Amino acid sequence: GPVWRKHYITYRINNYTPDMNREDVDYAIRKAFQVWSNVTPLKFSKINTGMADILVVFARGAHGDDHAFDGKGGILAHAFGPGSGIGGDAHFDEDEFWTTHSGGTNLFLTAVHEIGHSLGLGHSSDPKAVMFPTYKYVDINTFRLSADDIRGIQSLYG
Ligand SMILES: [Ca+2]
Ligand SMILES: [Ca+2]
Ligand SMILES: [Ca+2]
Ligand SMILES: [Zn+2]
Ligand SMILES: [Zn+2]
């Protein structure tokens, strides 16, 4: 599968979920990028204008790619592996209730998983990995990538 062949990667938040404070959206996505650059050579920067490598989108139902969201529950978000255009982009189902904590769906945790996909990771069979397909709330202040997450991103980069 695809990997980014460049070290400086950019993202853009396209729009903001009304479920949270704006600064909290900025912080959650910031923090999620840092999870991955802590273990690879990549550097991530937020730009506010023009074409980003990774476009962060809150949308609901059918939203202009071929992967319709399905209302509350089920599919929480999805992301496209490295490549041009929509390659790299990470979309969050606005029909979920995005939060900074354990109520609704923790944006930070979901973003870590989705940027994993933006960077070219698939899913892990290990329930303990963040790349396990099913969403588990863990304390975000003491969150750490599992061994398997680290082996996986490391074999793509670095
Ligand atoms: Ca893109
Ligand atoms: Ca959903
Ligand atoms: Ca929402
Ligand atoms: Zn989408
Ligand atoms: Zn996934």
Ligand number nearest CA of 55 is 1
Single out the residue of 140, 65, 147 nearest to residue 106, CA to CA: 140
- The residue written with tokens 């750490």 in the block is 144
CB burial of residue 147 (10 Å; 0-12, 13-18, 19+): exposed
Experimental method, per PDB record: X-ray
Alpha-carbon distance values, 131 to 51, 114, 128, 152 (Å): 27, 8, 9, 9
User: Helix axis angle, 107-118 relative to 22-37, nearest 10°?
Assistant: 50
- Superfamily per CATH, domain 1-158: Collagenase (Catalytic Domain) (3.40.390.10)
- What are the two backbone dihedrals, phi and then psi, of residue 6, each rounded to the nearest 5 degrees? -150, 155
Does 89 show up as a binding residue in the annotation?
Answer: yes
Question: 5 - beta bridge partners?
Answer: none
Give the resolution in Å: 1.9
Check: CB of residue 53 under 8 Å from CB of residue 42: no
Cα angle, residue 131 at apex, residues 9 and 24 outer, rounded to 5°: 60
Asked if 23 is an active-site residue, the reply is no
Radius of gyration of the chain, Cα coordinates, nearest whole angstrom: 14
Query: What separation in Å is there between the alpha carbon of 113 and the centre of ligand 5?
Result: 6
